Structure formats: C-alpha cells, structure tokens
Subunit: 80 residues, 4 copies
C-alpha cells in the first residue's frame, strides 16, 4: 500500500484479500497479488475488515466512521 | 461514531454489525446502516468484540473492564 | 482486569472467554462472569488470544514471547 | 521472538501457529513450540495473519506491504 498496514487481512469466499492501510484506503487484492479495487476514506484504516453473509465488507476508520462497502468497491453506507 | 473506530467489527447471526469506538461506546448497527443500540462504557473501546453461542457480546475497555452485553443492549456483567 | 483491556476476547468451546490485559495477565472467565484463572506474563498483553483444536490458548506478550497455555492455566511452552 | 509480539496468532489446519513480531519477522511455530520457519520483512509486523483456503499466509507490515507467504516460508508476492 502507501503506508503502514497495521490492520489485519480478511479473506472472502472467492479468495480476495481485504486490508486497510495507513494511506487512508481499504484494499481488495486478488490471490495472484494484483489490485482488484481500492476504496478511499478520510483517515487511516487501523481496524480490521469483516465480511458479512452477502459479502459486504465492514471496516472502521480514523475519520469516526464505520464503512459498509459492496464487493465491487462502491460505498453501501457509512455510519458516523 | 463520535471518534476514531480503531476496533474491528464483529457480525452476529442476523447480520448485526458490532464495533467499539473511541467515544467510549459499543455500537450495534443493522445491515441497512441504522443504529440498533449503543452501550456506554468508561473509556475508549479499542478492542474488538466477540460473540458467544447465545449471542452475548464481549469486548474490553480502557476503563480496565471486560464487558458482557446482552443482544438487546443491556449489561450482562463486567469483570474488573 | 487491573488495566486497559486493549486485546480482543476469544471464546472456547464450553463458553469460556479469554482476553489479555495491560496488567500483564491473560484472563479466563466463565460465561457467568466469575474468574476461572489468570496467567501472569512479563509485560502487557496487547495481542488477542487464539484457541487451537485441543483447546490450547496462544497469545503474544510485550516481553517478547508467544505463550502457549493449557486450558487449566498452566504454561505449556513459551517461544522467545 | 526478538521483540514485542503485538500481533495476534493465527492457526493453520495442521496446528501451526503464525504470529508477527516487532523484530520484523513473521513466525511459524509447531504445536510443540519449536520453530518451523521465520520470514524477514522490512519493519515491525503489528498486524495479524490470515490463512487462505490453500494455506497461504497473509499479513501486513510497517514497511507499507501486504505479504503473501507460502506454507513453506517462501515469499509468494507482496503488494506495495
Ligand atoms: Zn511509512
Ligand atoms: Zn493521514
Ligand atoms: Zn477524531
Ligand atoms: Zn476518552
Ligand atoms: Zn488504566
Ligand atoms: Zn507494565
Ligand atoms: Zn522489548
Ligand atoms: Zn524496527
């Protein structure tokens, strides 16, 4: 990523690895190591992502938000 | 939330997302992004929640406590 | 506990909650909230415990060690 | 290890414990407590490892990288 990866990776059902970074982004990476997508938040993502039963990704941010992100990298919602 | 969300979200059997915040609270949020309940502790909740077999939520706090909280947001117990 | 509980609780097959504390200890607590045992390490336990298939508890410490602890609270081993 | 173990251990299907350390290394340890292998990264490993369906280990580092490491301790890839 573009900064320290303090957060811990989660794995989806098709093998995708999700992890947050200090550069403010949540990363989605393919098992072959090429970027799937990146989602841009307002602060460092120290917390670790969780995957719901439909494949929604949830992760917290230093900008005071819990994000919900669809498997395709579009925002679902963010609770402040 | 009202501060940095350093802690990592847990997911219940009915889809509820649980996460602690720096504003001292444990949050319970519905998959549609509306607040279910919030439980108020004495310090920042950096640690990540765990869900037991009956659905009790456990999480630690900076106020020296491990909290046990019923699925409805009432305190079960807190060990100091 | 006796200090900030930064670490995140793990749950055993019989419901026991395990969490580390800043007071240097790994705690084992019963679902009713009474202390089962406490194991004493050389520094703050920020990391979160894992449970193996036989029920061994593993957790790291600030004293440079990964601890392995039997379900009864006796040390199995510690790798430095 | 050679420094604080802030990160939280993951367990493989054959019982191996994986944990990162502050001495910059990801450790693979056998249930009997003897070192299996150690993988050397460019900074402190605060984040916690995840295990994929083929047994690949993923963990982040302070050197800005997410590492993918084969079960035998050779690098698979690292995304920067
Ligand atoms: Zn850096
Ligand atoms: Zn920043
Ligand atoms: Zn803030
Ligand atoms: Zn405060
Ligand atoms: Zn204190
Ligand atoms: Zn101390
Ligand atoms: Zn040290
Ligand atoms: Zn260093």
């Amino acid at each position: 990523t573009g900064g320290s990866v303090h957060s811990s990776p989660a794995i989806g059902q098709d093998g995708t690895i999700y992890v947050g970074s200090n550069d403010h982004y949540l990363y989605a990476i393919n098992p072959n190591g090429k970027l799937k997508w990146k989602f841009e938040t307002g602060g460092s993502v120290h917390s670790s992502p969780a995957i719901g039963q439909d494949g929604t990704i949830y992760v917290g941010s230093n900008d005071h938000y819990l994000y919900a992100i669809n498997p395709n990298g579009k925002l679902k919602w963010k609770f402040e």
